[PDB]
A paper describes a structure:
The m1G37 modification also prevents the ribosome from shifting out of the three-nucleotide [name] codon frame (‘frameshifting’) to ensure the correct polypeptide is expressed. The absence of m1G37 in tRNAPro causes high levels of +1 frameshifting on so-called ‘slippery’ or polynucleotide [name] sequences where four nucleotides encode for a single proline codon. To address this question, here we solved six 70S structures of tRNAPro-CGG in the presence or absence of the m1G37 modification and bound to either cognate or slippery codons in the P site. We further show that ribosomes bound to [name]-[name] pairs that result in +1 frameshifts promoted by tRNAPro-CGG result in large conformational changes of the 30S head domain, consequently biasing the [name]-[name] pair toward the E site.
We next asked how ASLPro interacts in the P site with a CCC-U codon, a slippery codon known to facilitate +1 frameshifts. In this X-ray structure solved to a resolution of 3.4 Å, we find two different conformations of the codon–anticodon interaction in the two molecules of the crystallographic asymmetric unit. In the first ribosome molecule, nucleotides G36 and G35 of ASLPro form Watson–Crick base-pairs with the first two nucleotides of the 0-frame [name] codon. A mismatch C+3•C34 forms at the third base-pair position of the codon–anticodon interaction and contains a single hydrogen bond between the Watson–Crick face of C+3 (the N3 position) and C34 (the N4 position). The codon–anticodon interaction is in the 0 frame as indicated by the clear phosphate density of the next [name] nucleotide, U+4. Strikingly, in the other ribosome molecule in the crystallographic asymmetric unit, the codon–anticodon interaction is in the +1 frame. The first two nucleotides of the anticodon (G36-G35) form Watson–Crick base-pairs with C+2-C+3 nucleotides of the [name] codon, respectively. At the third position of the codon–anticodon interaction, a cis-Watson–Crick U+4•C34 pair forms that contains a single hydrogen bond between the Watson–Crick face of U+4 (the O4 position) and C34 (the N4 position). The absence of electron density for the next nucleotide in the [name] confirms the +1 frame of the codon–anticodon interaction as this is the last nucleotide of the [name]. Therefore, although the m1G37 modification is present in ASLPro, the shift in the +1 frame can still occur.
Author numbering:
A (entry chain RD): 2 to 273
B (entry chain R7): 1 to 47
Write the structure that this text describes.
Amino acid sequence: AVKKFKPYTPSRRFMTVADFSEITKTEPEKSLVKPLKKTGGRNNQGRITVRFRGGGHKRLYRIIDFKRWDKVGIPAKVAAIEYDPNRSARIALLHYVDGEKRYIIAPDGLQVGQQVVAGPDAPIQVGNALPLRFIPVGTVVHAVELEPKKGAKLARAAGTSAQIQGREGDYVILRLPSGELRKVHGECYATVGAVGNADHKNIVLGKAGRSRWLGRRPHVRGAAMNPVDHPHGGGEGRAPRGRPPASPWGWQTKGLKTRKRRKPSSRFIIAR
Amino acid sequence: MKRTWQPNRRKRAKTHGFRARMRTPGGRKVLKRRRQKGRWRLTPAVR
RNA sequence: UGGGAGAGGGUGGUGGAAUUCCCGGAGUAGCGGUGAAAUGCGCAGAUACCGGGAGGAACGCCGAUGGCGAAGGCAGCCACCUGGUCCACCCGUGACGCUGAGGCGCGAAAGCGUGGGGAGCAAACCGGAUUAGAUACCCGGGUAGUCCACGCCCUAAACG
RNA sequence: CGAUGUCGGCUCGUCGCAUCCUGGGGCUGAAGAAGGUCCCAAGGGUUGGGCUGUUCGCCCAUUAAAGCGGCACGCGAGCUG
RNA sequence: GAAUGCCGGCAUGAGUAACGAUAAAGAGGGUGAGAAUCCCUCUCGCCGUAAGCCCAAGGGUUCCUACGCAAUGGUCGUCAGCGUAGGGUUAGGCGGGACCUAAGGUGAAGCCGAAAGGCGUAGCCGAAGGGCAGCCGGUUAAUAUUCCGGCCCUUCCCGCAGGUGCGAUGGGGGGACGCUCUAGGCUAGGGGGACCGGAGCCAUGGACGAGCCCGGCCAGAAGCGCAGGGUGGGAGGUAGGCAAAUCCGCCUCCCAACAAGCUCUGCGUGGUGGGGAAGCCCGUACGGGUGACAACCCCCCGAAGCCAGGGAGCCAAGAAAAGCCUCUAAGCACAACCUGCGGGAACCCGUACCGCAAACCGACACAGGUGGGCGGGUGCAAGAGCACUCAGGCGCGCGGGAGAACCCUCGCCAAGGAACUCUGCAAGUUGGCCCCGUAACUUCGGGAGAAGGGGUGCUCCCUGGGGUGAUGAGCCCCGGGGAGCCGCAGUGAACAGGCUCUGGCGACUGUUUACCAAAAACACAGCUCUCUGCGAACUCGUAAGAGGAGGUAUAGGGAGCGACGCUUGCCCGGUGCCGGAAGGUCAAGGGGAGGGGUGCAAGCCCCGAACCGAAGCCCCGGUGAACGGCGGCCGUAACUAUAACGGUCCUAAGGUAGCGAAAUUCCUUGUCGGGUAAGUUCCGACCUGCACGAAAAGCGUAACGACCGGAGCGCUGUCUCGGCGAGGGACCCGGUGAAAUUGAACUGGCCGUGAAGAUGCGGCCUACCCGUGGCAGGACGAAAAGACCCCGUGGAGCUUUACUGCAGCC
RNA sequence: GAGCUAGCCCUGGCCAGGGUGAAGCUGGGGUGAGACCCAGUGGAGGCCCGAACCGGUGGGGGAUGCAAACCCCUCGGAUGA
RNA sequence: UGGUUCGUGGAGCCAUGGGGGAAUCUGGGCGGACCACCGCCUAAGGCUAAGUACUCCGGGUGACCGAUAGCGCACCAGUAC
Ligand SMILES: [Mg+2]
Ligand SMILES: [Mg+2]
Ligand SMILES: [Mg+2]
Ligand SMILES: [Mg+2]
Ligand SMILES: [Mg+2]
Ligand SMILES: [Mg+2]
Ligand SMILES: [Mg+2]
Ligand SMILES: [Mg+2]
Ligand SMILES: [Mg+2]
Ligand SMILES: [Mg+2]
Ligand SMILES: [Mg+2]
Ligand SMILES: [Mg+2]
Ligand SMILES: [Mg+2]
Ligand SMILES: [Mg+2]
Ligand SMILES: [Mg+2]
Ligand SMILES: [Mg+2]
Ligand SMILES: [Mg+2]
Ligand SMILES: [Mg+2]
Ligand SMILES: [Mg+2]
Ligand SMILES: [Mg+2]
Ligand SMILES: [Mg+2]
Ligand SMILES: [Mg+2]
Ligand SMILES: [Mg+2]
Ligand SMILES: [Mg+2]
Ligand SMILES: [Mg+2]
Ligand SMILES: [Mg+2]
Ligand SMILES: [Mg+2]
Ligand SMILES: [Mg+2]
Ligand SMILES: [Mg+2]
Ligand SMILES: [Mg+2]
Ligand SMILES: [Mg+2]
Ligand SMILES: [Mg+2]
Ligand SMILES: [Mg+2]
Ligand SMILES: [Mg+2]
Ligand SMILES: [Mg+2]
Ligand SMILES: [Mg+2]
Ligand SMILES: [Mg+2]
Ligand SMILES: [Mg+2]
Ligand SMILES: [Mg+2]
Ligand SMILES: [Mg+2]
Ligand SMILES: [Mg+2]
Ligand SMILES: [Mg+2]
Ligand SMILES: [Mg+2]
Ligand SMILES: [Mg+2]
Ligand SMILES: [Mg+2]
Ligand SMILES: [Mg+2]
Ligand SMILES: [Mg+2]
Ligand SMILES: [Mg+2]
Ligand SMILES: [Mg+2]
Ligand SMILES: [Mg+2]
Ligand SMILES: [Mg+2]
Ligand SMILES: [Mg+2]
Ligand SMILES: [Mg+2]
Ligand SMILES: [Mg+2]
Ligand SMILES: [Mg+2]
Ligand SMILES: [Mg+2]
Ligand SMILES: [Mg+2]
Ligand SMILES: [Mg+2]
Ligand SMILES: [Mg+2]
Ligand SMILES: [Mg+2]
Ligand SMILES: [Mg+2]
Ligand SMILES: [Mg+2]
Ligand SMILES: [Mg+2]
Ligand SMILES: [Mg+2]
Ligand SMILES: [Mg+2]
Ligand SMILES: [Mg+2]
Ligand SMILES: [Mg+2]
Ligand SMILES: [Mg+2]
Ligand SMILES: [Mg+2]
Ligand SMILES: [Mg+2]
Ligand SMILES: [Mg+2]
Ligand SMILES: [Mg+2]
Ligand SMILES: [Mg+2]
Ligand SMILES: [Mg+2]
Ligand SMILES: [Mg+2]
Ligand SMILES: [Mg+2]
Ligand SMILES: [Mg+2]
Ligand SMILES: [Mg+2]
Ligand SMILES: [Mg+2]
Ligand SMILES: [Mg+2]
Ligand SMILES: [Mg+2]
Ligand SMILES: [Mg+2]
Ligand SMILES: [Mg+2]
Ligand SMILES: [Mg+2]
Ligand SMILES: [Mg+2]
Ligand SMILES: [Mg+2]
Ligand SMILES: [Mg+2]
Ligand SMILES: [Mg+2]
Ligand SMILES: [Mg+2]
Ligand SMILES: [Mg+2]
Ligand SMILES: [Mg+2]
Ligand SMILES: [Mg+2]
Ligand SMILES: [Mg+2]
Ligand SMILES: [Mg+2]
Ligand SMILES: [Mg+2]
Ligand SMILES: [Mg+2]
Ligand SMILES: [Mg+2]
Ligand SMILES: [Mg+2]
Ligand SMILES: [Mg+2]
Ligand SMILES: [Mg+2]
Ligand SMILES: [Mg+2]
Ligand SMILES: [Mg+2]
Ligand SMILES: [Mg+2]
Ligand SMILES: [Mg+2]
Ligand SMILES: [Mg+2]
Ligand SMILES: [Mg+2]
Ligand SMILES: [Mg+2]
Ligand SMILES: [Mg+2]
Ligand SMILES: [Mg+2]
Ligand SMILES: [Mg+2]
Ligand SMILES: [Mg+2]
Ligand SMILES: [Mg+2]
Ligand SMILES: [Mg+2]
Ligand SMILES: [Mg+2]
Ligand SMILES: [Mg+2]
Ligand SMILES: [Mg+2]
Ligand SMILES: [Mg+2]
Ligand SMILES: [Mg+2]
Ligand SMILES: [Mg+2]
Ligand SMILES: [Mg+2]
Ligand SMILES: [Mg+2]
Ligand SMILES: [Mg+2]
Ligand SMILES: [Mg+2]
Ligand SMILES: [Mg+2]
Ligand SMILES: [Mg+2]
Ligand SMILES: [Mg+2]
Ligand SMILES: [Mg+2]
Ligand SMILES: [Mg+2]
Ligand SMILES: [Mg+2]
Ligand SMILES: [Mg+2]
Ligand SMILES: [Mg+2]
Ligand SMILES: [Mg+2]
Ligand SMILES: [Mg+2]
Ligand SMILES: [Mg+2]
Ligand SMILES: [Mg+2]
Ligand SMILES: [Mg+2]
Ligand SMILES: [Mg+2]
Ligand SMILES: [Mg+2]
Ligand SMILES: [Mg+2]
Ligand SMILES: [Mg+2]
Ligand SMILES: [Mg+2]
Ligand SMILES: [Mg+2]
Ligand SMILES: [Mg+2]
Ligand SMILES: [Mg+2]
Ligand SMILES: [Mg+2]
Ligand SMILES: [Mg+2]
Ligand SMILES: [Mg+2]
Ligand SMILES: [Mg+2]
Ligand SMILES: [Mg+2]
Ligand SMILES: [Mg+2]
Ligand SMILES: [Mg+2]
Ligand SMILES: [Mg+2]
Ligand SMILES: [Mg+2]
Ligand SMILES: [Mg+2]
Ligand SMILES: [Mg+2]
Ligand SMILES: [Mg+2]
Ligand SMILES: [Mg+2]
Ligand SMILES: [Mg+2]
Ligand SMILES: [Mg+2]
Ligand SMILES: [Mg+2]
Ligand SMILES: [Mg+2]
Ligand SMILES: [Mg+2]
Ligand SMILES: [Mg+2]
Ligand SMILES: [Mg+2]
Ligand SMILES: [Mg+2]
Ligand SMILES: [Mg+2]
Ligand SMILES: [Mg+2]
Ligand SMILES: [Mg+2]
Ligand SMILES: [Mg+2]
Ligand SMILES: [Mg+2]
Ligand SMILES: [Mg+2]
Ligand SMILES: [Mg+2]
Ligand SMILES: [Mg+2]
Ligand SMILES: [Mg+2]
Ligand SMILES: [Mg+2]
Ligand SMILES: [Mg+2]
Ligand SMILES: [Mg+2]
Ligand SMILES: [Mg+2]
Ligand SMILES: [Mg+2]
Ligand SMILES: [Mg+2]
Ligand SMILES: [Mg+2]
Ligand SMILES: [Mg+2]
Ligand SMILES: [Mg+2]
Ligand SMILES: [Mg+2]
Ligand SMILES: [Mg+2]
Ligand SMILES: [Mg+2]
Ligand SMILES: [Mg+2]
Ligand SMILES: [Mg+2]
Ligand SMILES: [Mg+2]
Ligand SMILES: [Mg+2]
Ligand SMILES: [Mg+2]
Ligand SMILES: [Mg+2]
Ligand SMILES: [Mg+2]
Ligand SMILES: [Mg+2]
Ligand SMILES: [Mg+2]
Ligand SMILES: [Mg+2]
Ligand SMILES: [Mg+2]
Ligand SMILES: [Mg+2]
Ligand SMILES: [Mg+2]
Ligand SMILES: [Mg+2]
Ligand SMILES: [Mg+2]
Ligand SMILES: [Mg+2]
Ligand SMILES: [Mg+2]
Ligand SMILES: [Mg+2]
Ligand SMILES: [Mg+2]
Ligand SMILES: [Mg+2]
Ligand SMILES: [Mg+2]
Ligand SMILES: [Mg+2]
Ligand SMILES: [Mg+2]
Ligand SMILES: [Mg+2]
């Protein structure tokens, strides 16, 4: 629903921000925040391991419930929908009838005021979490555990959704957001709805700096490098790739698969 | 212009000083060499 | 006021046949294709058969010189929302009417922008035949597109 | 090669003559005027511009003429670059 | 006797360059053995968002005083930041620790590693962050928020008095937070004043005057007042805050909707405490007395500071823990806690001095570098700008003369204006504010300060708005109209764009080669390809572990292109990558046909053929925004010319669109046209593209550009073509006094000669001895064991289908 | 050895004064309802002019220097990568 | 795989990281692949002086030096810098 800009500077010609229309509460719940360690790419050795990170806006981390079999049977009233900086989705503030407050991430089509509940016996209705063995086949669904009681791994980004295409025995068959078809165990919880903020991927950042506010630093091509630095480096003049196109560490980056071949997960994976 | 030696009594003691020699097995051999030399200051004098 | 018909339109949902692909079984020396052949597919087990699964598009019989709409145009079924129209009763208002330069809206198909989707067909493109030659007609592949949402384009043998 | 700084421009000259002009002369297919060619002759003079890093060259407008070469293709402990 | 040899010593250059900002000096008087340089007075100049105060870092005695001058001071020195000696730094309230946590470090539990060691939850350490109780003056030669004076506070510990279930390192609240823009009321700060208090002064033509000059404050408990911040109050129900809770959280009705009530700050007032100018008189270097019984009043401007956790908006969504409050748990409830009072107790370290600099970092009393706060006044529209100047601090630790060339930094110029030159390089024109007015083009924002104009000072009169005060005077902020005055000139000084047309590259702001390159290179939003289903892929690591990520296909990695507009054609034969349970080949291992060596034999020990044996390669397909590639020869059309057309060779295919003598064009200054008097550059065309061409992208593109090219207008010392003037050097004198270089030197020209470029050889010529200011032709001048070339079976960096290995992967 | 320098993490600070005037609000116009168009308010931006601050474009000086990167004139950014 | 003179060699012996895996005197290793004969030792637990190496320190001696030599230092030196 994505809010655009008159071209009164050169960067504001193309820059789009999101609407923030579903946001009801501008300031996060005090008992559910804890500080993000900004890391900068830098591991415990101090070395860069992911290049070109840092410089971001400071963030407080919002504790998300990715389990929701913690609190089976206890319904919750949706009290607020909020901005999480740490993820593409929005988040929903739940006041449970206990008075435990939790965040969950926000489906498409939540309203404030409404009631959600996890359950094998919850209604099949947006925001409720069931095992996958109890959701009817053909529903779209999100927040999907991959192995049971290990918490939600699958379909967490903004707009994303997985669909149940079958059962087979203990296991159910998911169309993942990649289009991968995968056997997931039936007792893995999953949370119905697709995820909201589906207009995330139409955001055009507009200028250089809005990359830097998110902690994405400048990315340097290997053709601008020198042959110690990169395979693509060097060449008096500009340079075609000269060789099959290649990472800084030597391996190819047009086509080369590196799914590990003897992985035990591949017996659970149908297509790709 | 801004030259190289910009002194700091925190940094001098925490880097070159005696308690940070004796963490490292290289740094204990520093004081061993300076004792065997006979130096009057095994560590840099900070105050 | 009381009724009637209709693919009139918008939204949500849903049913079956068939094409393609994938998986399993069985099964052989050929299948497609044409005027005829060839490209092509096939002993790495194709076509032809059965069973399961996924996906998209269009809805056979009803069905026609039929209906509906101002035009473009509209066809499985279900529900919601909604426009037009016709008949009867002759009840009310009481000339309130006709057309309409501009304006405003709608406007097949092709085309364009963002995202999705892509089974079949199919510009461009690639082969194989015809021919003196083929940038075509015929044949085998095949990308945009054809589909959806939103925004444009504003055309025609938009014809009675 | 335990270093002789390379092109072009500027500044500053100085030298040679196989002379562009000026001076003297022979022959002329030299009527006159203007020329051609050769001999003597360096004392002096030998312009300002457009283009190009240019030297050279091509044009513009003049001129009596718009000379060719040497001096480490003179001259960077003189300058530019 | 040589090694550009090592160490030391002393010479040459040479009384030469220089003496470290062109902010500036002159005189009188003292001390002294000795004064331009030390102290005092007068005159002059310089800084004054500092070149003036206060913090922090760093430095470590440099502070003050007394006595000195060998060395240090770029001269001198009686002076000093120097030598000797003595003195000086006082804290419950300032900073830090017996408080807390952040990144990080360490690290019992635990994980890993040949050893050394590497990780790691809780914990602990870790500070310009959070927490916490002191303001104003006075004394010293030198310390003070530290001592003294006044006023006011915080912790403990022990007592009594009155209240309450008290009670944890445990639960909860709070602490607690972004950027930008702001309202109200204050304070700091400043301006004015006829009012108040002052020593005094009428000068030189006038003035005894609401004259001139100086000053009209500071802190301050309780209690009021004015601003403002935080906050709902009961009742039940309760399974969540890992035990328990009356607390918190979540429901359900009742009264508020407000700050009404509670607290809590800020600011005024406040008992009382203190300060108190100019001028004059002095005896120090620095200070004192008087002026004073001082006055200590009123207006205006007003903050970026306070109320503070204020309000509004926005996306990029903005630390933790303790102090503090509350709630229970054991234990206790003769306790323990809270409020009031009294008595008592309150440790360790720093404190001097410099601190945009002569005391820090630069070997130096070095024109460089160094974080935070105050930083007055007037005018210029505003300002931390600029000019002058309060307080305050300086005249930069060599001077005196002279008035050449030459150099640096300035000023001016006849006539001409780019003729200079690689280039208007440099320098000049323009310059601030107000009002007219402003083109192509465009992404409708811009282009725009387009361009080009007019106004600009002062006096008098009339006149409209606000803010503070009562609607009023005054004080302040803004305007309008009319009439005049002066000068060459009115932003009268200083600070303050030259403009336009056109092309190339890159969309734009940005980034880089610290110390010769700021660009068309890098980056950039944006496009595509590819990988990656999560103990992800990728990366660091032997491992453990960690980043990715406390992310989950709208996410993460890798590669290329690089906003946007219109587009990205053909070749999959070779290389890469992807898909193929067939087939060829393929190692260990299985398998033993058969044979061998020894034994008197049972035996023991060897080879060893079929056949079964993975990945990989061969093979079959796919794949270009993967690596890459994208032709040649003949003939033909009613005049030549040309070839729409055809024939033919080869290829995997034979360059499509769009550009094109281009950042690409050798021939080349191609050829036409435009500009010019004249144009190897420029702009527009043709295509004969040596050798453009579609994501190492193609062709365009408004705006942007300290990028690169061409042209014109204005303007000028760039030039014709120079001239004059100013200052800092240069020159002379006094003081101090280097350097690279140097075989020794008694060191001329020509023509020859010589290892082929002679002061030194030969012949001739010329020439008394020695300096100073200058110029650079030579001494193959100095400096660097040439960096271009070659050599060395010299070395490093980089590449690959060179060789051979290794990590990694299968 | 990261007290220079490059990147990142934690915690603080700094950016005088002027211009332009996006969204959004309010009134009005408009329509069946709208889109939309006027004003007024508003105060956005890797916006503009320019000190501190960060740089280092062109020229000149310097060249055994004040300086082993300096000085003068000029110039770029200056609410943000 | 390492050690030994042993660099795969006819490669034994000794120690081993991986796989298989006995016996207790009629049992086992060895004498350089292997076999026979003849011989030599008794693994898979550990301790053990002296003879050997060095010179921070004390002493003796020198066809060793004599302040550019001898230690870096004869001297308040691992100091000043
Ligand atoms: Mg928290
Ligand atoms: Mg760590
Ligand atoms: Mg470490
Ligand atoms: Mg890049
Ligand atoms: Mg490069
Ligand atoms: Mg490197
Ligand atoms: Mg490489
Ligand atoms: Mg390359
Ligand atoms: Mg090239
Ligand atoms: Mg009737
Ligand atoms: Mg009538
Ligand atoms: Mg249409
Ligand atoms: Mg269509
Ligand atoms: Mg489309
Ligand atoms: Mg087809
Ligand atoms: Mg076809
Ligand atoms: Mg018709
Ligand atoms: Mg040479
Ligand atoms: Mg020499
Ligand atoms: Mg002659
Ligand atoms: Mg003559
Ligand atoms: Mg003659
Ligand atoms: Mg003649
Ligand atoms: Mg004649
Ligand atoms: Mg010209
Ligand atoms: Mg030129
Ligand atoms: Mg030449
Ligand atoms: Mg000549
Ligand atoms: Mg020559
Ligand atoms: Mg020459
Ligand atoms: Mg030259
Ligand atoms: Mg140059
Ligand atoms: Mg050059
Ligand atoms: Mg000799
Ligand atoms: Mg010698
Ligand atoms: Mg010497
Ligand atoms: Mg001398
Ligand atoms: Mg002299
Ligand atoms: Mg001399
Ligand atoms: Mg001299
Ligand atoms: Mg001198
Ligand atoms: Mg005397
Ligand atoms: Mg400090
Ligand atoms: Mg200190
Ligand atoms: Mg010092
Ligand atoms: Mg001292
Ligand atoms: Mg004295
Ligand atoms: Mg002295
Ligand atoms: Mg003495
Ligand atoms: Mg002296
Ligand atoms: Mg000195
Ligand atoms: Mg004396
Ligand atoms: Mg002193
Ligand atoms: Mg002293
Ligand atoms: Mg203690
Ligand atoms: Mg204690
Ligand atoms: Mg502590
Ligand atoms: Mg702690
Ligand atoms: Mg550790
Ligand atoms: Mg250990
Ligand atoms: Mg830790
Ligand atoms: Mg602190
Ligand atoms: Mg603090
Ligand atoms: Mg304190
Ligand atoms: Mg005081
Ligand atoms: Mg003092
Ligand atoms: Mg006191
Ligand atoms: Mg209690
Ligand atoms: Mg807490
Ligand atoms: Mg707590
Ligand atoms: Mg005041
Ligand atoms: Mg008076
Ligand atoms: Mg008088
Ligand atoms: Mg006053
Ligand atoms: Mg006051
Ligand atoms: Mg007061
Ligand atoms: Mg309540
Ligand atoms: Mg409980
Ligand atoms: Mg209120
Ligand atoms: Mg009070
Ligand atoms: Mg007084
Ligand atoms: Mg006085
Ligand atoms: Mg607030
Ligand atoms: Mg703690
Ligand atoms: Mg002190
Ligand atoms: Mg002090
Ligand atoms: Mg300062
Ligand atoms: Mg110094
Ligand atoms: Mg230095
Ligand atoms: Mg010093
Ligand atoms: Mg000095
Ligand atoms: Mg200095
Ligand atoms: Mg400076
Ligand atoms: Mg500074
Ligand atoms: Mg001020
Ligand atoms: Mg001022
Ligand atoms: Mg004035
Ligand atoms: Mg002012
Ligand atoms: Mg101004
Ligand atoms: Mg200020
Ligand atoms: Mg100033
Ligand atoms: Mg003064
Ligand atoms: Mg001086
Ligand atoms: Mg004059
Ligand atoms: Mg002139
Ligand atoms: Mg003139
Ligand atoms: Mg002119
Ligand atoms: Mg010229
Ligand atoms: Mg010329
Ligand atoms: Mg030019
Ligand atoms: Mg210029
Ligand atoms: Mg002017
Ligand atoms: Mg233009
Ligand atoms: Mg405009
Ligand atoms: Mg103007
Ligand atoms: Mg006047
Ligand atoms: Mg006021
Ligand atoms: Mg008023
Ligand atoms: Mg005038
Ligand atoms: Mg000016
Ligand atoms: Mg060009
Ligand atoms: Mg750029
Ligand atoms: Mg472009
Ligand atoms: Mg700009
Ligand atoms: Mg830029
Ligand atoms: Mg550089
Ligand atoms: Mg360098
Ligand atoms: Mg530069
Ligand atoms: Mg693009
Ligand atoms: Mg897109
Ligand atoms: Mg590794
Ligand atoms: Mg991990
Ligand atoms: Mg994590
Ligand atoms: Mg991706
Ligand atoms: Mg990516
Ligand atoms: Mg590129
Ligand atoms: Mg490009
Ligand atoms: Mg366009
Ligand atoms: Mg292509
Ligand atoms: Mg290919
Ligand atoms: Mg291929
Ligand atoms: Mg192929
Ligand atoms: Mg393969
Ligand atoms: Mg074998
Ligand atoms: Mg075998
Ligand atoms: Mg075998
Ligand atoms: Mg195989
Ligand atoms: Mg012909
Ligand atoms: Mg042909
Ligand atoms: Mg083509
Ligand atoms: Mg041309
Ligand atoms: Mg012409
Ligand atoms: Mg012409
Ligand atoms: Mg021409
Ligand atoms: Mg052209
Ligand atoms: Mg051409
Ligand atoms: Mg070319
Ligand atoms: Mg190209
Ligand atoms: Mg190319
Ligand atoms: Mg390409
Ligand atoms: Mg282009
Ligand atoms: Mg352009
Ligand atoms: Mg341009
Ligand atoms: Mg001149
Ligand atoms: Mg002169
Ligand atoms: Mg002068
Ligand atoms: Mg002298
Ligand atoms: Mg000679
Ligand atoms: Mg001679
Ligand atoms: Mg001789
Ligand atoms: Mg001389
Ligand atoms: Mg000379
Ligand atoms: Mg000279
Ligand atoms: Mg020379
Ligand atoms: Mg030389
Ligand atoms: Mg050499
Ligand atoms: Mg070099
Ligand atoms: Mg060789
Ligand atoms: Mg070699
Ligand atoms: Mg390996
Ligand atoms: Mg650093
Ligand atoms: Mg400002
Ligand atoms: Mg508006
Ligand atoms: Mg603004
Ligand atoms: Mg800006
Ligand atoms: Mg600026
Ligand atoms: Mg400041
Ligand atoms: Mg700096
Ligand atoms: Mg830089
Ligand atoms: Mg510069
Ligand atoms: Mg320079
Ligand atoms: Mg500037
Ligand atoms: Mg500018
Ligand atoms: Mg061996
Ligand atoms: Mg061996
Ligand atoms: Mg061998
Ligand atoms: Mg061996
Ligand atoms: Mg073993
Ligand atoms: Mg073993
Ligand atoms: Mg054996
Ligand atoms: Mg043996
Ligand atoms: Mg044996
Ligand atoms: Mg034997
Ligand atoms: Mg034996
Ligand atoms: Mg034994
Ligand atoms: Mg001894
Ligand atoms: Mg001797
Ligand atoms: Mg010695
Ligand atoms: Mg001696
Ligand atoms: Mg020695």
